[PDB]
C-alpha cells in the first residue's frame, strides 16, 4: 500500500536489496561454483508473502 | 592499521579523546572521499583509520575498567560486572565449606573413630 509501517518498509527495502546477482569479481575466484543467485524473485513471477 | 599500541599507552586521558576526536574527523572526510570518486589510496586510508578508532577505544575502555576493578577490590557491595565469572548454576550451589559442614556430634565421632589403616596376613 501507499501507507505502511516503519518496520514493514525496512523489511520491504531489504527484499529489494537481496534481489541482486553475483558480482563478476566473485565469479572469478578459484574453485567457485556460485554463478547465479537461486534466491531471486520478480514482482510478477513470485509473491514474497509479506 | 598504523597507530601502534605503545603510542596509545603513553598518551594521557585527555590525549585519548583529543586523538579520538581528530581520528573521527579524519574518517568523516574519508567517507566523503569514497563517495566523490577519491583515489584508491584514500580508500586504503579509510580502512586503516577504522582500526585506529577501534584500537584507541579498546585502550580507553580497558584502562577505565581495570581502574574500576581496583576501586571495588575491597568493596563489600561489588557491582555485578566486576564479580568473578561463573555460570548461573554456580552462584546458586552451596559452597564447599557449607557442603562439608558436620554436626558437633558427628564431628567428634569422626575424630575419635577414624578409618584406621590395616591389612590382613595371609
Amino acid at each position: 500500500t501507499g501507507h505502511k509501517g516503519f518496520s514493514y518498509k525496512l523489511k520491504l527495502g531489504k527484499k529489494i536489496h537481496q534481489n541482486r546477482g553475483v558480482p563478476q569479481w566473485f565469479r572469478m575466484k578459484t574453485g567457485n561454483t556460485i554463478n547465479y543467485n537461486f534466491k531471486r524473485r520478480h514482482w510478477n513471477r513470485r509473491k514474497m508473502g509479506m | 592499521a598504523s597507530l601502534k599500541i605503545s603510542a596509545i599507552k603513553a598518551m594521557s586521558k585527555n590525549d585519548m579523546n583529543a586523538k579520538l576526536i581528530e581520528l573521527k574527523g579524519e574518517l568523516a572526510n574519508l567517507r566523503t572521499a569514497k563517495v566523490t570518486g577519491g583515489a584508491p589510496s584514500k580508500i586504503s586510508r579509510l580502512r586503516v583509520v577504522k582500526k585506529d578508532i577501534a584500537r584507541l577505544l579498546t585502550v580507553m575502555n580497558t584502562q577505565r575498567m581495570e581502574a574500576l576493578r581496583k576501586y571495588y577490590k575491597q568493596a563489600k557491595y561489588v557491582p555485578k560486572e566486576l564479580r568473578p565469572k561463573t555460570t548461573r548454576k554456580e552462584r546458586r550451589q552451596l559452597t564447599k565449606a557449607q557442603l562439608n559442614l558436620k554436626t558437633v556430634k558427628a564431628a567428634k565421632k569422626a575424630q575419635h573413630f577414624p578409618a584406621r589403616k590395616f591389612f590382613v596376613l595371609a
Binding site: Y8, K11 | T87
Partner: protein, 72 residues
C-alpha cells in the same frame, strides 16, 4: 461461483509477521501467533509436530552466547 470468481475479493490480510518468530503467523483478530505461540510465554511445541521441532529450536540459530559457554 465457488471457484475462480470468488477469489477476486481476497485482499484482506489474516496473518502478519510475528515479533517473536518472524513468520507471517500472527493472527490479527485472534491476537496470537499460530506458529510460535505469542504472548504465551512458552514457545509452542508439540510432540506430533516433530518436523516443526527440528525447524526452529536450539541449534538452528546463531547461539551468540551459548557457543562460548559450552566451549568453556
Amino acid at each position: 461461483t465457488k471457484g475462480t470468481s470468488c477469489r477476486g475479493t481476497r485482499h484482506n490480510k489474516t496473518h502478519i509477521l510475528c515479533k517473536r518468530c518472524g513468520k507471517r503467523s500472527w493472527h490479527l483478530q485472534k491476537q496470537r501467533c499460530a506458529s510460535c505461540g505469542y504472548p504465551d510465554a512458552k514457545m509452542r511445541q508439540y510432540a506430533w509436530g516433530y518436523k516443526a521441532l527440528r525447524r526452529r529450536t536450539q541449534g538452528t540459530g546463531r547461539m551468540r552466547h551459548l557457543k562460548i559457554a559450552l566451549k568453556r
